Design a protein around this ligand. Structure first.
Ligand SMILES: [Fe+3]
Length: 53
């Protein structure tokens, strides 16, 4: 699934993970660390919204 950072527009794609920041591919948004932030603007996880209907 994909989740968008409502602050900058970054898209956390579970399939891609965030390797740069210690998150391998396939890591579900809910399994990210409570301390994980957007790699682009630093917004907390709370500012992400899943892309679903
Ligand atoms: Fe962001």
């Amino acid at each position: 699934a994909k989740w968008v950072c409502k602050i900058c527009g970054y898209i956390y794609d579970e399939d891609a993970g965030d390797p740069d920041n210690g998150i391998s591919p396939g890591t579900k948004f809910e399994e990210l660390p409570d301390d994980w932030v957007c790699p682009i603007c630093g917004a907390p996880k709370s500012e992400f919204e899943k892309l679903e209907d």
